[PDB]
Amino acid sequence: PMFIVNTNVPRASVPDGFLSELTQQLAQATGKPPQYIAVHVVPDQLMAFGGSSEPCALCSLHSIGKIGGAQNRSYSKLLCGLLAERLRISPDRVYINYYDMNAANVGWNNSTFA
Amino acid sequence: PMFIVNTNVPRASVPDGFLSELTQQLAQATGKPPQYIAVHVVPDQLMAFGGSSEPCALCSLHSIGKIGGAQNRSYSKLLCGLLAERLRISPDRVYINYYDMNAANVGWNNSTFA
Amino acid sequence: PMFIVNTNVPRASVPDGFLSELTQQLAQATGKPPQYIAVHVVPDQLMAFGGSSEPCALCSLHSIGKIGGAQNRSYSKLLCGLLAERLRISPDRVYINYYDMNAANVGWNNSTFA
Numbered sequence: 287p288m289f290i291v292n293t294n295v296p297r298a299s300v301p302d303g304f305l306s307e308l309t310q311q312l313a314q315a316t317g318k319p320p321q322y323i324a325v326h327v328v329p330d331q332l333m334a335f336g337g338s339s340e341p342c343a344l345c346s347l348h349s350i351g352k353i354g355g356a357q358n359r360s361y362s363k364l365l366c367g368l369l370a371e372r373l374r375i376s377p378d379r380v381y382i383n384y385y386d387m388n389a390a391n392v393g394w395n396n397s398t399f400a
Numbered sequence: 401p402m403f404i405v406n407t408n409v410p411r412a413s414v415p416d417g418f419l420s421e422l423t424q425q426l427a428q429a430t431g432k433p434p435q436y437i438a439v440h441v442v443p444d445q446l447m448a449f450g451g452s453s454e455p456c457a458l459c460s461l462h463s464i465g466k467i468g469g470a471q472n473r474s475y476s477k478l479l480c481g482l483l484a485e486r487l488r489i490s491p492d493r494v495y496i497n498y499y500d501m502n503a504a505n506v507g508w509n510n511s512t513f514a
Numbered sequence: 515p516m517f518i519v520n521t522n523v524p525r526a527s528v529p530d531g532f533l534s535e536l537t538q539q540l541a542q543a544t545g546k547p548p549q550y551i552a553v554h555v556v557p558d559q560l561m562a563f564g565g566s567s568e569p570c571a572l573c574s575l576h577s578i579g580k581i582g583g584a585q586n587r588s589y590s591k592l593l594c595g596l597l598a599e600r601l602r603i604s605p606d607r608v609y610i611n612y613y614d615m616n617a618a619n620v621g622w623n624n625s626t627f628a
């Protein structure tokens with residue numbers, strides 16, 4: 287799993303431990319060990335959501351499997367909750383794109399997961 | 401609809417009002433209320449296009465529907481026109497990737513659009 | 515072809531000529547002329563891989579064709595080799611997502627490619 291968050295909130299507002307929390311909670315939610323999980327947080331971005339530059343986030347979760355209707359609803363509850371409590375972003379100003387990757391289309395360590 | 405533009409032109413060359421314009425233009429182009437549109441502009445990037453570091457852009461447009469052959473041709477003229485007029489980027493130094501998302505694969509407000 | 519690298523390596527550790535090298539190597543590997551290739555390198559990112567913030571990279575290779583099981587394994591060796599040598603990133607801390615784009619979903623120069 288790979289989780290990316292782009293946000294307009296300032297870097298100084300990202301709390302200590304946030305990357306680790308995303309890693310831990312994504313391991314719990316996807317069932318993949320933390321060693322398999324990558325996270326990327328991009329603050330200070332020029333962004334608007336609904337025509338407003340109030341705090342917002344655009345995110346993506348890529349995963350080899352573990353993507354689907356009910357799973358994605360659960361991930362959205364989890365991830366919006368973290369963005370609200372940690373980054374102060376209202377859940378109605380977050381989009382998350384979910385991508386189910388074929389293992390042959392994910393490279394790692396001089397090979398792919400096919 | 402979510403529109404992202406990454407460019408090597410400097411931040412100071414992004415005009416005041418650009419995010420608002422992108423929101424309004426995309427609302428009209430997709431026929432959707434502006435409350436649904438998210439935009440993200442990333443200047444000052446380390447980029448090359450065709451081996452050259454002259455002004456360029458790499459963009460993406462994600463939407464649940466409203467993506468397809470004819471629509472994408474229209475979006476490309478609109479978006480290249482905005483990048484040319486507002487950021488002085490030649491249309492032949494712009495790539496835009498168009499992504500049609502399933503509703504179940506887009507999270508928002510603690511759930512998904514499914 | 516469009517190649518994007520996101521990394522926590524600092525900007526000063528990205529060697530001069532890296533974008534040109536990526537362009538030339540991708541031209542050889544994909545068979546497309548350099549004129550067709552775009553590259554984007556994003557240093558200084560806030561990232562973790564397996565819960566650790568040692569040097570890592572999350573990358574994408576989009577291409578109209580030239581994507582598949584065997585090709586992607588070859589690209590991963592090429593790209594992990596370059597990231598290891600040029601950015602000093604361990605290859606087990608690199609993920610690369612491969613995307614085969616339909617030409618009708620790629621905009622350029624005021625229209626699409628199909």
Ligand SMILES: *C(=S)NCc1ccc(NS(C)(=O)=O)cc1
Pocket residue numbers: 287288318322323348349350389392399
């Ligand atoms: C998130 S995208 N992690 C990468 C990853 C690597 C391997 C697997 N398992 S396998 C080899 O496909 O069975 C899952 C996720």
Ligand SMILES: *C(=S)NCc1ccc(NS(C)(=O)=O)cc1
Pocket residue numbers: 401402436437438462463464465503513
């Ligand atoms: C851009 S990605 N905006 C979000 C959004 C939400 C819904 C829809 N379409 S629908 C028919 O309501 O599912 C499109 C875009």
Ligand SMILES: *C(=S)NCc1ccc(NS(C)(=O)=O)cc1
Pocket residue numbers: 515516546550551552576577578617627
């Ligand atoms: C990488 S994604 N380069 C873009 C690109 C554009 C055109 C072509 N050829 S064609 C026959 O016009 O579609 C290949 C790659």
